[PDB]
Design a binder for this molecule. Structure first.
Ligand SMILES: CC(C)(COP(=O)(O)OP(=O)(O)OC[C@H]1O[C@@H](n2cnc3c(N)ncnc32)[C@H](O)[C@@H]1OP(=O)(O)O)[C@@H](O)C(=O)NCCC(=O)NCCS
Ligand SMILES: CC(C)(COP(=O)(O)OP(=O)(O)OC[C@H]1O[C@@H](n2cnc3c(N)ncnc32)[C@H](O)[C@@H]1OP(=O)(O)O)[C@@H](O)C(=O)NCCC(=O)NCCS
Lengths: 179, 177
């Protein structure tokens, strides 16, 4: 049941579906070592079948409006993932998560995809409050937030376990009302 | 059966199927009151629907993904203290609570909260306790300050309630045993 959110001449967001699993799994394996530097989970990655269960879970949430999982394709090549880890329908708030294949960084691809996604959901009107939580020492992530006009709202002490230590987490938000 | 002691007159009991009739009654009795601060009370309907929700929370509770405890005062069900959600890897949980309106003003929530947090910190599986609460919910913000939570931030228009969006304070306390 295909769903695309245009981003640019070379970029688009496609709702995750079963056919994306093999390529997404490979993409995770390919970037596993570098992602483990910023994220805890790449570690537990094992088989394509387990990755499938996870996507399958997100697809149900995506369909019920309780989360979203989009894959970023650059020139028809899978380049990364942009998601709402959770949506709070009544508060019209959503928490954002993302990562890019390492050789796709530095081209404003995440910023553009993010800008397109947020715009899409604010115009639909079902999400107006967008949140990014990211480790205080995640430089690239904090830069995405700033560049995309999120307001720092606070800092959560030792909120995130990563590589043997609990790290502080900046909390950013941006409110968009398509009046 | 799980009980966390609090005082000679107070204890916390993990919610179970047997509590459903009385919990459903307490919720009906306090609906109007709770709607002043909470959005969920007005979707309340039948005892069956309540049993549905408790069965699901009991599974989360057993799996360690949330906890639902009932506060008993001299053997009378007086409110709920729960971890709305736990992030096992981060050893962090989000706190939710409410008291029947007539049990306010006796430190019942503070005492229960204190025992609960100390219990989990001794277990070692939760070290970070979080309280999200509306900037204008005086009673809740008092619970967080009274119990030594530190204000970490203020979330703009994070909660929709009674026709308005409200800024929400985020408090946290880290306890290592
Ligand atoms: C976080 C992450 C997605 C950011 O990647 P990114 O490529 O830096 O992000 P953007 O797409 O916004 O690109 C910004 C960069 O591209 C440049 N750029 C080029 N064209 C651009 C455009 N059209 N618009 C905006 N920036 C543009 C900017 O100058 C900037 O360059 P610089 O960082 O070299 O100064 C990436 O580092 C990654 O996947 N990290 C690992 C996983 C992780 O940390 N995820 C987040 C956990 S909270
Ligand atoms: C939030 C709520 C649980 C707070 O109730 P509470 O009774 O005020 O909480 P506490 O247990 O901390 O009791 C503190 C009060 O009892 C008093 N008290 C008496 N003995 C006490 C004791 N031994 N220890 C601590 N406080 C004591 C305090 O002085 C204080 O009185 P005050 O309100 O006049 O200042 C209650 O108002 C409620 O259920 N609200 C509606 C639902 C809601 O807001 N939930 C939270 C959503 S974030």
């Amino acid at each position: 049941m295909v769903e695309i959110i245009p981003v640019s001449t070379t970029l688009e967001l496609r709702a995750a579906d079963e056919s994306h699993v093999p390529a997404l799994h490979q993409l995770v394996l390919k970037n596993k070592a570098w992602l483990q530097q910023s994220l805890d989970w790449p570690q537990y990655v094992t088989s394509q079948e387990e990755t499938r269960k996870h996507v399958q879970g997100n697809i149900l949430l995506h369909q019920r409006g309780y989360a979203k999982m989009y894959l970023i394709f650059c020139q028809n090549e899978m380049a990364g993932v942009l998601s709402f880890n959770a949506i709070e329908p009544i508060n019209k708030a959503a928490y954002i998560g993302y990562w890019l294949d390492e050789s796709f960084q530095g081209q404003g691809i995440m910023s553009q995809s993010l800008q397109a996604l947020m715009t899409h959901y604010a115009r639909r009107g079902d999400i107006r409050r967008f949140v990014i939580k990211c480790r205080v020492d995640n430089q690239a992530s904090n830069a995405v937030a700033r560049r995309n006009h999120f307001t720092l709202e606070g800092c959560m002490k030792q909120a995130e376990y990563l590589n043997g230590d609990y790290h502080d987490v900046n909390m950013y938000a941006r409110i968009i009302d398509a009046d």
